[PDB]
């Protein structure tokens, strides 16, 4: 997964971080980043529709009782 | 260490096509799924169902005596 | 009918041991109606077991 | 979680009746179950102490 640099030879650095941004981080801190990044992250609605239909059946049978009471 | 001054011709590879394929799997599993706007619509629908349920309960209470 | 559903509440929901039935415990025959009235939460057996335990607690008091 | 549960619209809890919706929605922390006993100010102060 290594990149394709245009410039062939690597260039020395003495810049303070105000001047420029660098990627100087080793592999172990990125393993820590992978550990902290990998772990950091319906039918019941239609079932409630069906239970509402069962409640419709319940109220209409109690209304049949209301007509026959 | 030692670094490289940037340019516009230095590029990064598609990383060996073992994460790009996983990224397309992420794209196809988030194509059909949660859409992040109907969540608040579910919230106002649950609020509406609750307030109408209390409305029906209080109405049949005050008419059942 | 109601008999199969009562066996589903007794043996499949509550997981009570099979030496107990509706005739050796009166509050079972009381509250099996209210258990069978609730069609959902049959995956949630723990709430029904705790409701059974609190009902046998409140029944056999001395107040 | 999100909205201030100010009035007595949401909190409700009985005993002896064995409300299995209360026991089933215990992890559902939105309809909280108060003990229906408003703590008076003296025991509130002593509780804070």
């Amino acid at each position: 997964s290594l990149l394709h640099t245009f410039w062939r030879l690597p260039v020395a650095v003495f810049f303070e971080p105000h001047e420029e941004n660098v990627l100087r981080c080793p592999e172990r801190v990125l393993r820590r980043l992978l550990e902290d990044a990998a772990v950091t992250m319906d039918r019941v609605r239609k079932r409630y529709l069906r239970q509402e239909l069962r409640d419709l059946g319940h109220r209409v049978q109690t209304y049949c009782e209301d007509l026959e009471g | 260490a030692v670094f490289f001054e940037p340019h516009e011709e230095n590029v990064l590879r598609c990383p060996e096509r073992v994460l790009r394929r996983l990224l397309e799997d992420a794209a196809v599993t988030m194509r059909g799924g949660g859409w992040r706007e109907d969540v608040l619509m579910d919230r106002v629908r649950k609020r509406y169902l609750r307030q109408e349920l209390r409305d029906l309960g209080h109405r049949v209470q005050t008419y059942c005596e | 009918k109601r008999d199969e559903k009562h066996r589903h509440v007794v043996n499949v929901v509550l997981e009570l041991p099979t030496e107990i039935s509706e005739a050796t415990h009166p509050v079972l025959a009381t509250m099996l109606s209210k258990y069978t009235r609730m069609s959902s939460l049959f995956n949630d057996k723990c709430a029904f077991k705790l409701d059974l335990l609190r009902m046998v607690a409140v029944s056999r008091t001395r107040r | 979680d999100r909205q201030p549960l100010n009035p007595a619209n949401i909190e409700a809890r009985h005993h002896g009746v064995s409300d299995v919706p209360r026991l089933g929605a215990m992890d559902a922390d939105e309809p909280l179950f108060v003990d229906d006993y408003r703590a008076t100010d003296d025991e509130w102060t002593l509780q804070k102490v």
Binding site: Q51, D55, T62 | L56, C64 | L41 | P21, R22
Partner: peptide, 20 residues
Amino acid sequence: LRQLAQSVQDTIQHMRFLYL
């Protein structure tokens, strides 16, 4: 008369917490 009405009324609010 009315106690039947209350015993059929009280089960309506028995379904809210398991629904939503």
